[PDB]
Amino acid sequence: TKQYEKSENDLKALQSVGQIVGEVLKQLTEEKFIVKATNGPRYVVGCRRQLDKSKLKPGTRVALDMTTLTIMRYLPREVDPLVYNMSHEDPGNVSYSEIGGLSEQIRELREVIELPLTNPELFQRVGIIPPKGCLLYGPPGTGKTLLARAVASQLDCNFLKVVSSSIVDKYIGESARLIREMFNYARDHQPCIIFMDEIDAIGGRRFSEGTSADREIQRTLMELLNQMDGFDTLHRVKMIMATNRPDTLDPALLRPGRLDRKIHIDLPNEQARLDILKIHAGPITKHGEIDYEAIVKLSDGFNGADLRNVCTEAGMFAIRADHDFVVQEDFMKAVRKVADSKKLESKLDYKPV
Amino acid sequence: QSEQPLQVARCTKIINADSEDPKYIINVKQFAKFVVDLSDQVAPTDIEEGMRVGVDRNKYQIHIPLPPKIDPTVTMMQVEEKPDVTY
Amino acid sequence: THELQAMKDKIKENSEKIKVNKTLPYLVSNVIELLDVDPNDSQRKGKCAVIKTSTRQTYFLPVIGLVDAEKLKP
Amino acid sequence: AVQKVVVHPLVLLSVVDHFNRIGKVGNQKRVVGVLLGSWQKKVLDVSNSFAVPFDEDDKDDSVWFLDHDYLENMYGMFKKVNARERIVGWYHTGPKLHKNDIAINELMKRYCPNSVLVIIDVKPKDLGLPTEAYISVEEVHDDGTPTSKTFEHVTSEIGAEEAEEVGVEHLLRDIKDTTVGTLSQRITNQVHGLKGLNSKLLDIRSYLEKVATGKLPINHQIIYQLQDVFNLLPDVSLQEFVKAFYLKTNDQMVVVYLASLIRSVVALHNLINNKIANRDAEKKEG
Numbered sequence: 033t034k035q036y037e038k039s040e041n042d043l044k045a046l047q048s049v050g051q052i053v054g055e056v057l058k059q060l061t062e063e064k065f066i067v068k069a070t071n072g073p074r075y076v077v078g079c080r081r082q083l084d085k086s087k088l089k090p091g092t093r094v095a096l097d098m099t100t101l102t103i104m105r106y107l108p109r110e111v112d113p114l115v116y117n118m119s120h121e122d123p124g125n126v127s128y129s130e131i132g133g134l135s136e137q138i139r140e141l142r143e144v145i146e147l148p149l150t151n152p153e154l155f156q157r158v159g160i161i162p163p164k165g166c167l168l169y170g171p172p173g174t175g176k177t178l179l180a181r182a183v184a185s186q187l188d189c190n191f192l193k194v195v196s197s198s199i200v201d202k203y204i205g206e207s208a209r210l211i212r213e214m215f216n217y218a219r220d221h222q223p224c225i226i227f228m229d230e231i232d233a234i235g236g237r238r239f240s241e242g243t244s245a246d247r248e249i250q251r252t253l254m255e256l257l258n259q260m261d262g263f264d265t266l267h268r269v270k271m272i273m274a275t276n277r278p279d280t281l282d283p284a285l286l287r288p289g290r291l292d293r294k295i296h297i298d299l300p301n302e303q304a305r306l307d308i309l310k311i312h313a314g315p316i317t318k319h320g321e322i323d324y325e326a327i328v329k330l331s332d333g334f335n336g337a338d339l340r341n342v343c344t345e346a347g348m349f350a351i352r353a354d355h356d357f358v359v360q361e362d363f364m365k366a367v368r369k370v371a372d373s374k375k376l377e378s379k380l381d382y383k384p385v
Numbered sequence: 386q387s388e389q390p391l392q393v394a395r396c397t398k399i400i401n402a403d404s405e406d407p408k409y410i411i412n413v414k415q416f417a418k419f420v421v422d423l424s425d426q427v428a429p430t431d432i433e434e435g436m437r438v439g440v441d442r443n444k445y446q447i448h449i450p451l452p453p454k455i456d457p458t459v460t461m462m463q464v465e466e467k468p469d470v471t472y
Numbered sequence: 473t474h475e476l477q478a479m480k481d482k483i484k485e486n487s488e489k490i491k492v493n494k495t496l497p498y499l500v501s502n503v504i505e506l507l508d509v510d511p512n513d514s515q516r517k518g519k520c521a522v523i524k525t526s527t528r529q530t531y532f533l534p535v536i537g538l539v540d541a542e543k544l545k546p
Numbered sequence: 547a548v549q550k551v552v553v554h555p556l557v558l559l560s561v562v563d564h565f566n567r568i569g570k571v572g573n574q575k576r577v578v579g580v581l582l583g584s585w586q587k588k589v590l591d592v593s594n595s596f597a598v599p600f601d602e603d604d605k606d607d608s609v610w611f612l613d614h615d616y617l618e619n620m621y622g623m624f625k626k627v628n629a630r631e632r633i634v635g636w637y638h639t640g641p642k643l644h645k646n647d648i649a650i651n652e653l654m655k656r657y658c659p660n661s662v663l664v665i666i667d668v669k670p671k672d673l674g675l676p677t678e679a680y681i682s683v684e685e686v687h688d689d690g691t692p693t694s695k696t697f698e699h700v701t702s703e704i705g706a707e708e709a710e711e712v713g714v715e716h717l718l719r720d721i722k723d724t725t726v727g728t729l730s731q732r733i734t735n736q737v738h739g740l741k742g743l744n745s746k747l748l749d750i751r752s753y754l755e756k757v758a759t760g761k762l763p764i765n766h767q768i769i770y771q772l773q774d775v776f777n778l779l780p781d782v783s784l785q786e787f788v789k790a791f792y793l794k795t796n797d798q799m800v801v802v803y804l805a806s807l808i809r810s811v812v813a814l815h816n817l818i819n820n821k822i823a824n825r826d827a828e829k830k831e832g
């Protein structure tokens with residue numbers, strides 16, 4: 033029962049008041065150390081006898097006391113968006129080769145990513161600069177989020193994710209230090225891979241500057257433009273971006289450097305649609321008599337999200353008939369009808385609104 | 386003689402959730418959240434979610450709920466003042 | 473084996489001091505996961521964490537005490 | 547284990563003010579209390595403590611009583627005000643310990659793994675830095691005795707702390723501080739020879755005393771082993787400095803040159819600026 037006495041004595045040590053944290057700036061002398069608290073005041077204070085030479089550091093966060101503001105222990109500094117960035121997930125592996133097309137985009141994205149990791153020798157011996165970035169835009173077909181994130185999730189602890197909602201951040205919020213942090217940790221984990229999706233809102237041009245909120249978009253831009261075209265070495269880390277249209281990217285992003293390789297997604301083709309139907313027919317049960325050319329021919333110019341989810345819509349029409357294994361006749365009904373209904377809903381392609 | 390009391394009334398704060406019957410939580414202008422009991426002068430049924438109430442900064446228990454607040458600066462003008470244009 | 477009750481009284485009085493720690497916070501904090509051990513310079517071992525505030529300040533206090541670091545993600 | 551300890555003047559007076567307690571009411575023995583230590587590192591530090599009623603019979607020289615009811619509850623009183631503060635051992639004012647102290651330390655080893663007793667001095671006399679520190683270990687012995695518990699001397703040094711120099715350093719007020727650079731180093735030179743050569747003469751007289759009687763101590767061997775470390779140079783007549791002679795004045799080389807060179811410029815600052823400023827005010831006044 034002495035564990036209670038042990039537990040309460042540990043809570044007696046909890047009577048010790050907590051301290052405050054700050055960032056070291058410089059040092060005037062041994063008895064005065066410039067430290068900037070997270071609030072922004074800067075103090076020059078002494079120190080106690082329990083610390084070492086590793087406490088000083090070149091501008092690293094420290095914990096200031098609440099009385100004399102002296103430093104107790106030092107800890108590594110992070111603003112910690114990254115743990116939130118690593119909270120993503122995705123199956124595959126397999127989903128790499130499941131899309132089926134285009135075969136040239138399947139093989140190339142495997143090279144520019146994996147080859148610099150395993151074989152740097154080809155770059156240094158031939159004397160060529162490997163691509164440090166890439167651009168995958170849409171939606172002329174699917175595979176943007178599927179193929180890129182598959183290698184991401186398979187690369188495990190080495191990856192960086194960016195959602196377009198985190199750039200605006202909060203009122204009078206600072207995303208300029210996020211752009212510098214995103215590329216700072218990109219230079220830590222190697223090779224790092226960064227995904228930026230739906231940049232049309234956060235890629236704001238400075239031609240027409242609305243209200244007070246367009247400039248803070250330009251600030252996040254110029255922070256991206258500086259480090260991607262640096263002057264700061266990104267050669268080992270790979271970057272990826274995504275957008276609906278490259279209208280607002282400006283000559284800065286449309287240029288090479290910051291955006292290196294722009295690979296346009298291609299819609300599924302009758303030859304390639306035969307492969308994507310094989311992977312769709314796996315999870316769904318079918319009748320013993322099935323023809324893959326029937327579904328491929330009846331559905332043309334449809335994205336992979338259209339084909340899959342309508343093939344599940346065919347299963348929802350199949351459960352309307354309660355049959356477990358269903359012939360493709362009931363499928364071709366639900367596949368053609370529901371898909372042709374989707375075509376009269378959204379205008380594009382080809383006509384803009 | 387009434388100097389000390391009624392001073393503690395600050396500040397105005399909106400409650401959010403209740404962990405138990407005696408204890409609630411209130412968001413206060415200091416930007417934190419106020420986990421509070423209530424004085425014997427006010428029944429627990431008078432404190433409901435999304436209500437502005439008072440406090441006693443000494444004992445920290447709730448003092449009295451204050452419902453009223455009227456408009457921002459923009460809509461207080463939008464309120465009608467006097468009749469005009471009679472038919 | 474009768475020392476239990478006298479020892480059980482101090483855990484409630486210390487909890488009574490937690491009951492005055494119950495009433496009442498003016499501060500709400502954000503949590504940051506941290507693991508820190510400093511060799512000196514006989515040995516002091518343990519774990520510490522980083523603590524934010526609603527007033528924009530960021531404080532420094534050892535790992536709580538009460539609820540441990542097993543839960544949860546910050 | 548425990549290498550060195552740090553004793554503050556605050557806890558020391560806590561032994562001294564209790565000497566005014568048992569001093570006016572009597573009678574025998576001395577001041578004995580339980581020591582509250584603070585361990586932040588291998589070096590030991592002591593801040594506060596509490597004095598406990600204690601008595602030791604003469605006859606009956608081995609009889610001693612600590613009060614554990616005063617030791618238990620008051621610890622919780624101090625544990626509540628100071629969590630890091632805990633009892634590191636006991637203490638007493640000596641001046642000379644008795645063999646019964648083996649029982650006082652072994653009884654309190656249930657509270658702390660190793661109890662360090664501190665012998666203090668209420669009236670400073672001789673020969674030097676006061677009080678004392680002892681640690682309890684077992685060295686057995688070379689002669690074949692049963693396992694022997696003998697307190698080994700621990701180097702003790704006084705130390706200061708913030709906010710505790712308010713009243714302490716104010717009340718004295720009579721000391722001249724420091725003053726480094728003139729009288730500070732030259733006073734110790736008269737002291738380092740005094741205190742250095744008296745313990746010399748005191749120990750060499752005891753070394754001669756070991757021949758007559760008092761053998762053992764044999765010692766062994768620390769007496770002559772550490773003496774021969776002093777014997778790297780004796781130094782004996784005369785100084786054997788034939789190799790260190792031309793080097794001697796060579797150490798006085800820079801010292802005399804910096805003296806004469808700077809003093810000539812200091813004179814140029816003292817003489818010139820004085821005659822200028824003096825001729826200014828003198829002849830222009832009348």
Ligand SMILES: Nc1ncnc2c1ncn2[C@@H]1O[C@H](COP(=O)(O)OP(=O)(O)OP(=O)(O)O)[C@@H](O)[C@H]1O
Nearest residue numbers: 131170171173174175176177178308335336337340
């Ligand atoms: N060929 C496919 N096979 C399996 N699932 C797919 C396929 N295409 C799309 N999906 C599903 O659709 C979701 C979105 O994929 P992706 O980003 O590649 O297309 P998209 O950009 O959403 O297309 P659109 O913009 O036309 O909706 C994914 O979660 C995926 O599960």
